[PDB]
Ligand binder design. Structure first.
Ligand SMILES: [Zn+2]
Ligand SMILES: [Zn+2]
Lengths: 96, 816, 96, 96, 96, 816
């Protein structure tokens, strides 16, 4: 799967707050470069990283206009300096 | 499956007609081989007949007022759109004649007319027009257009002149006599395939043979194009042909010319402070403080200064003038002396060409001449030099249209050849060179030179048509109105290989392969006059492809070969490093390269040949996951060495070829669970139909795998549990004491040893072991036949291959 | 959010077969017409329609290739011929 | 695992109303009799039975109090009158 | 909910490996003491803790006979030295 | 809902009968008040009639061979189990007579006979036996048992002797004359309620009035028990009554006696090295090296040595002997001199009691006496002292059975009172004290003393019957075979309060409240002779309850009061700190304590009274989540102060009482979203039926809330958005310029100001605002009526309460 088409879908999630949560799973894994992955979270607030047995889990969040945040979680692994993503998770949370 | 609305974007009326026809026929129904004489598919021939019939009808409509109103009445009678009546008429007509092959079973035609949503009253006319004569006189335009399209596409008319010999002598004469009454003639123009003609042929069909002038191109046959002539229209003139095609050479790119300008600025900048200082006290700059005079290499550094006649000598004559004047206008206000010294002293082999104000002084002349106004004398001598070379290289172009572009239905405006005493002959292509300058500096015996033709071909292979190439030819020819329509887009999908013979139609599998139908084709180079089309491999894969064709990188472009074939209506595909590599000729298509592996052999049907390489695409997609970036080339080699060996006894074993001897890591859990499971059900499906042996193997492995999960009702199995009882049978089958045994005893003892080792680990049933025992017989029956043929040292390697496939099927029947 | 935005996200799901499963949840609901709902279904096989207390759930299925089908179920409600979609589910199943 | 073990876990779910939702997944399947399956249902209202390709899904509902109902759905298959349960779902819904 | 009854249910999960995964949610929250919570994970291998905005997420794991592990995740918060649990998650994983 | 199989565990045949009858009747159908004369519920009276009818039938079955075979034929005629015929016969009979209240509407009886799965032919006999005479002669046992049960449970027979006066004089005489022919007499034994009798009454029904001796206890009436006498059976003898009940006092606990032994070992251990050394060289141990002689407090430290007659004086006479001999046998081998010195010198007020070998020497005597063998003389003087006190304290027990346990159908074995010159009278209870020892050391005027009775009551209130208490009385009486059956279990559920009048039956709501039916009741103390039953509060809640009854902790035990009532078949409940606090008497039940809040007032029906406190249980369950461990007592006080004030004008406002003035934190988001939402739909449900005002408020708030989400079709609301337009109306309604207005103008201006502030923020509809305007009228109509009554300073606090409830309903209608 070309990252061009995945970004074509993720832009709708960033631009539509009506999207409360989205859980998507890839099979086979989608490969992206380090620059493509960094360009997605370049403007994010990193939260955690979990070095699993054979899957790296990271969590990020952004802030939106008010008390509303956009959460992001993904599981991935690295091979030959490309990033293979297992699954992605988005959901919006409101809290102080 | 793409958005069923977004494919309709850019809806050329012909595109929807081809989409609808392919959507109507079954995939395995259009892929079928047509006739025994030449490689033709049902999809290619029937679509071509309808396309040409559509072109001839639109020609009659646009050329004759009487045919226009006749087509209007014929359209209103059946209540169909004009072009829909014209296209589907020839499409259904060809299916009705190609069905004459042994099956009659005309029942297939009713499914097509139903999905097209067309009245059967229209089919009643076609089924009596394909055989028989006119339904009535009003159907004359359809009778003319379709019979001509049927004539133009006989299994191998093979030549442009054979059309005009089939024309008047055979039964096709009645259609052409009526085409005469529609004030439409037949005509043709023969041409030879060449690299520059490949990019330039599209412009001829737009600026010469366009509908505006009334020529209506129809089809090409590798030795020319066949079109029409409406009476009293202008004759095809060579003057505009030479005027357009020489313009494609004498029009260097607007950024390539900017680069050659920057190559000049790179030199005169290196000593900018001296050229700027030369605006005053020249004697202080030209002389060195320690001695007499400086030489020009101290101002014009050799490392950075290429001579002008070698810099811009790669371009045409008019482009050299634009280089000189743009460099002059850009830098005259800053360093006019650097411009003077550069052109005067760095003009390469024609070194002394500056006699105007040429004092003969070797280097001191700068003190002994007038100021900047004298630089324009160089621009005048550049005008007098390039405009004269322009007339000589335009004459060098003309002979291509006197000798090669020949055998035509056009007239010659050109003065004959004799510009006496041609200065030389080209060393590679052989065309006579007349211009005084060219020498072979491409980047007993004296000197060799090259013509301005194959240097323009080089400037194309540098970027625009860089090798390698996918090549697909058509037999006997291909409609021109269809070449400039078919395109592809692999950028969003890469390789795709899943096809079903009947579950989806041809168009579903067409778009599934990434095929596109667009009004302006952009990823495809149709060699019009050559009845073939060439695909640049850089627009197929994003890999850094080499300039030749490595046998290790052929294993990487091959997964695209069958896709290219299906996109072009199941036609033979050739992978090559040079455009001029000629195809080898069977009733079935062939996928080939410079050196052919055995697994690329053409099976007895186009459907099985496609499955044979589609099976390799599925394996390549798994090795993509397994081996790393550097191990893959070594991985694909060990796989290909096995496939080429297994297919040498039967192609079904070529489908089952994966490796699993030693070679690249034998580790099974790292290979099966990681990549090969999602494609195993497809590889087994291909195996069960490429040969009778594969059908026996597929049914026997599943009959054991189904019985294995029926006996081992738990997922607690090890790798040795489901494969061990079979390995004990293989060991029994190949140890030298049993190899001597008779055939009926060697297979009987091995299957008994297999079930005996199985029953010692698990409990079977009296009625349940019989199917396992019967399947083990058929397996060892084939292991004996692939030992009669071939060798024991290979039958053991196949046994280890089959033993691992049993583990694969066991994990495959649990997937549900 | 209208179907013009949701179609940009659905085109990605239909083209890329690597997406094994994706779950969409809306808040508020995405408003689509009965016509746009019919065009998203006309080529799929319907399998189940159940009328909840205030959420009608309907599922569909496309055949992609071989034995892999793309299934798709909806949670929505209707008023004034307008269709408000609560959530969307897509997943690809191996069906014998 | 038999119903004698599963009943010890179900008695907790029926007594404590604080359990808002609980999802059970078995591997391998829990084997119960047709009689024990009937005794787990006889007092509940059946709402839906659908026969999957190889997994029959049936749901039920008890009335607890006021407008709160305890819903319960199954995924199972039958052979030789033996019932093998793939997974179990319990949740309490406010129903008008 | 008395911890006596919750432990009556959790013992079946520890003693039956057929239970592949269980996700249960409490509403209202179940209160347990620090000793009751420590006695549950006294013999566990702690993995992570996440101090959320108003919910503490912890993850634990045990080892079982072979290459099979039992995972545990719970979200909770503390009030008046009692532990109020929001939800619990169990699942069994096999890996080196 | 518990496991429908696990409730059937320990299936006593009577338990399933009560389960089935309660499962058949609707909850709101059995809770209904029976008659106007006394507080009785349909569930309590009908179950009691069937229970007594079951007992009388089993008595006839076990006493007469002719009644046995008569009941066998009567059971075989209808084909029902024996005890099922006997129980359901009286149960259906009582429903047929209590339905004489205004409704006739006998249609209800068909639902009961259907769910019981019984033939209607049986109902045809009952409906003609309740009114009318015998179906035939074979139904005589049922006619006797049921008419006796109907007699024994008239609204307020009120006394044991009133049964025997109703007996022969009224129409019940015909049943007793037939009971005579079943060789069964009636009898009764009157008794006074006392703490020791509470624990000991169960053993009398097992060792005295058991079926083995043929007495068959039936029912009690607060002044005695009513049972039977099969002819020629032994008379009820007081000798075994005094023999058993004095044994319950003269049987100290086996670990309490171990503690009193440890109190002795605590002293003699403190100077163990001296007592061990005293086995030789006594003169070296008793004398101090600096002077003459040591005194005993240097060997017997006063801080750790309690005197023996004060240690074991709390127990009985036989237990003192076991203490002395077990202490002697345990420690004679180690420190026999410590045992000697302890008993000889630490015997408290009877200090000089050791005259045997009492040399009269003050302290030197240890040198002047014989060895360890002399210690047994103390055990002899202990035997001669305690066995004599035993005869005196057993006589102190006897007068309870000469004066209190009186008015009986038993005979007296005891010698009369005159053991002349009783030594004293008890200072608290008044019973004559005869033993020489007791003095008031419970832990103008000379000395006061106490009897061995109320010191045994103290040893029970120390742990086994420690206050506070839940008390529930029955009118006119309660069957004994039902008291020893009903139990409860709150340990797994704590408080539960959700009940529906008709959606579930009585038994479903019974077990939902944690009610249990077990053969051996263990969490309940039935005061048999008192026709009441007492629940120890420690077995209800795990809170560290005090010994009295704090008004702040009454707010914590109250959520269990209605549950206790329903478990005991809807009967009045009293929460008290002392067992002897007497109940106050209406046709409806009452939940009360020493000081009654206004919200505990008994509404016009038992169903509404239960809902009134069940509403408080729901609020207590929310404050449990809100306020912390220390703030809750202050939180419940501010809530109770408001509920007691709001219910003083209408109980519907008591249901809506939550606070929401100031008091404990006014923060709304910390209170509504955190706890009160899951119980709001239930509090509103209770409000809509406790009064006509509450029905007007519930329908009006929802009619606005439904219209609010219909207008505000988005969840973007603030707290001020949905409440602001109403607050502007409340401000308009209470500012002094509008308070003077007439009634029709003050409500008309305020509702106009409410809708005017609403329409300025959002758009209404002409047909949609009319329901909001009509509901706002009814709201401000009630705000005027609760200002006519009460005060403006309270109507504003109620308005703020109602204004916040509108926010609650808006969030409640979106929950679906
Ligand atoms: Zn050349
Ligand atoms: Zn006393």
């Amino acid at each position: 799967m070309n990252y061009k088409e995945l970004e074509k879908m993720l832009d709708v999630i960033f631009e539509n707050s009506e999207i409360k949560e989205i859980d998507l799973f890839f099979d086979p894994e989608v490969e992206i470069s380090k620059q493509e992955f960094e360009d997605l979270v370049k403007n994010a607030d990193p939260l955690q990283k979990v070095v699993g047995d054979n899957y790296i889990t990271e969590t990020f969040e952004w802030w939106e206009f008010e008390n509303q945040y956009l959460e992001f979680e993904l599981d991935y692994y690295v091979k030959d300096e490309k990033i293979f993503v297992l699954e992605m998770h988005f959901w919006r949370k409101i809290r102080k | 499956m793409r958005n069923l609305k977004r494919i309709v974007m850019g809806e050329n009326k012909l595109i929807g007609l081809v989409r609808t026809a392919l959507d109507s026929i079954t995939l395995g129904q259009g892929v079928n081989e047509a006739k025994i004489k030449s490689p033709q598919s049902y999809a290619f021939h029937t679509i071509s007949v309808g396309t040409i019939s559509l072109d001839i009808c639109k020609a009659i409509y646009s050329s004759s007022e009487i045919g226009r109103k006749q087509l209007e009445n014929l359209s209103k009678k059946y209540n169909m759109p004009f072009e829909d009546l014209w296209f589907y008429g020839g499409f259904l007509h060809d299916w009705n004649k190609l069905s004459g092959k042994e099956e009659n079973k005309e029942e297939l035609t009713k499914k097509i007319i139903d999905k097209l949503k067309l009245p059967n009253e229209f089919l009643h006319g076609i089924s009596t027009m394909a055989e028989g004569h006119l339904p009535d006189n009003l159907h004359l335009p359809l009778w003319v257009s379709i019979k001509l399209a049927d004539m133009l596409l006989i299994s191998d008319i093979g030549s442009v002149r054979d059309v005009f010999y089939f024309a008047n002598s055979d039964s096709y004469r009645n259609a052409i006599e009526a085409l005469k009454e529609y004030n439409l003639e037949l005509n043709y123009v023969s041409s030879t395939f060449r690299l520059f003609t490949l990019i330039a042929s599209k412009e001829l069909l737009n600026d010469v043979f366009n509908e505006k002038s009334g020529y209506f191109p129809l089809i090409s046959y590798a030795d020319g194009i066949v079109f029409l002539k409406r009476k009293n229209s202008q004759p095809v003139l060579l003057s505009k042909i030479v005027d357009l095609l020489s313009r494609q050479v004498f029009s260097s790119s607007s950024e390539v010319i900017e680069e050659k300008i920057s190559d000049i600025e790179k030199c005169i900048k290196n000593k900018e402070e001296l050229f700027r200082q030369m605006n005053i006290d020249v004697k202080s700059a030209i002389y060195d403080e320690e001695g007499k005079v400086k030489q020009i290499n101290a101002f014009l550094p050799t490392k950075v200064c290429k001579p002008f006649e070698d810099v811009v000598g790669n371009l045409d004559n008019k482009s050299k003038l634009q280089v000189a004047r743009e460099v002059i206008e850009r830098n005259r206000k800053d360093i006019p002396f650097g411009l003077l010294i550069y052109f005067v002293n760095k003009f390469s082999k024609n070194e002394e060409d500056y006699i105007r104000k040429g004092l003969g002084i070797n280097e001191k002349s700068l003190k002994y001449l007038l100021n900047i106004g004298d630089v324009q004398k160089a621009l005048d001598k550049i005008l007098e030099l390039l405009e004269k070379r322009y007339a000589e290289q335009s004459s060098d172009k003309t002979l291509l249209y006197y000798v090669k572009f020949s055998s035509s239905g056009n007239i010659i405006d050109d003065l004959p050849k004799i510009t006496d005493r041609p200065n030389d002959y080209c060393v590679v292509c052989g065309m006579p060179i007349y211009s005084s300058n060219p020498v072979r500096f491409v980047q007993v015996r004296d000197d060799w030179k090259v013509c301005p033709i194959c240097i323009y071909e080089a400037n194309l292979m540098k970027d625009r048509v860089k090798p390698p190439y996918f090549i697909v030819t058509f037999y006997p020819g291909v409609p021109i109105s269809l070449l400039n329509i078919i395109d592809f887009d692999f950028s969003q999908s890469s390789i795709k290989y899943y096809i079903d013979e009947e579950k989806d139609t041809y168009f579903t599998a067409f778009e599934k392969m990434g095929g596109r139908l667009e009004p302006y084709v952009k990823k495809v180079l149709p060699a019009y006059f050559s009845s073939k089309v060439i695909i640049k491999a850089s627009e197929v894969s994003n890999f850094s492809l080499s300039t030749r064709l490595s046998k290790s990188e052929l294993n990487k472009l091959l997964p695209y070969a069958p896709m290219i074939s299906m996109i072009f209506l199941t036609s033979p595909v050739l992978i090559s490093s040079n455009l001029y590599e000629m195809p080898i000729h069977e009733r079935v298509i062939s996928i080939t390269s410079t050196y052919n592996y055995t697994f690329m052999k053409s099976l007895n049907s186009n459907l099985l040949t496609l499955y044979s390489i589609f099976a390799y695409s599925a394996k390549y997609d798994a090795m993509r996951k397994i081996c790393g970036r550097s191990d893959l080339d070594n991985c694909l080699g060990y796989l290909t060495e096995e496939m080429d060996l297994y297919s040498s006894v039967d192609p079904a074993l070529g489908v089952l070829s994966i490796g699993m001897g030693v070679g690249t890591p034998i580790d099974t859990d790292e290979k099966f669970f990681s990549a090969f499971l999602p494609v195993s059900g497809y590889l087994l499906k291909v195996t069960g139909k490429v040969s009778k042996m594969g059908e026996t193997l597929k049914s026997s492995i599943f009959s054991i795998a189904y019985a294995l999960k029926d006996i081992i009702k738990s997922q607690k199995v090890s790798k040795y549990d489901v494969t061990g009882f079979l390995r004990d049978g293989v060991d029994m089958f190949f140890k030298t004491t049993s190899v001597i045994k008779d055939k009926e005893d060697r297979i009987g003892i091995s299957v008994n040893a297999a079930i005996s080792s199985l029953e010692n680990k698990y409990a079977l049933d009296d009625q349940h072991r019989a199917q396992v025992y019967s399947a083990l017989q058929d397996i060892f029956k084939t292991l004996y036949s692939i030992e009669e043929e071939s060798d024991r040292s290979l039958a053991i390697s196949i046994a280890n291959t089959l033993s691992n496939w049993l583990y694969i099927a066991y994990k495959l029947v649990l997937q549900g």
